[PDB]
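Let's do one together. I've listed all components of the complex below, 225 residues spread over two lines.
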Amino acid sequence: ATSGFKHLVVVKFKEDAKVDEILKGLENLVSQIDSVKSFEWGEDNESHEMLRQGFTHAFSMTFENKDAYVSFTGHPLHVEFSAAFTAVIDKIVVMDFTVAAVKSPVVVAPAAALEWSHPQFE
Amino acid sequence: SGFKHLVVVKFKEDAKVDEILKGLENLVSQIDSVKSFEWGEDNESHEMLRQGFTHAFSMTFENKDAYVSFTGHPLHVEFSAAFTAVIDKIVVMDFTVAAVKSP
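Okay, and this is what the predicted structure of the assembly comes out as:
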């Protein structure tokens, strides 16, 4: 069961980074690019530092599949954003993966419930 | 879109990752306060950006209170204790979700 392909970025920003402008920039980027199906983010600067390792922000973009993600990485707006983003981060973890959809309150991966019904052609 | 508990990890070389993940799937399936659970594996993207992490998973809760309660759940406590022994490193983040775009 897969709900799509996720581009996950966990970051710590440089001390002087203008985080609100960076966030406005991400909001603007995602709104302009149709291939981005979902975008959410959060900040955690409260939880334990031995487990968080100083990371403060996590951003999650979802795509219909890996091919759509690969295309997005070539999108000029994303390439430009990327270059600027490099300048304002202290550290980063990037993860790109097919999502295993295990539990959700609403349907996110319908095909997984029905693929058994495909006829056997051989 | 609620409160998220996000974990990014690298497992020890000898860990039985498939079994560990089946265990976590089983945990979350039995606890009503866990609204969503997903995970993935990435051992393909650039190492200078992934830093050797291979798996990510996230649980979503209706709010921070539900998450805090869940962290006290005995089965979660026992799972976490055992999980400690099979990881090389971990990043954990817990946050209110700002939903910016969705379908």
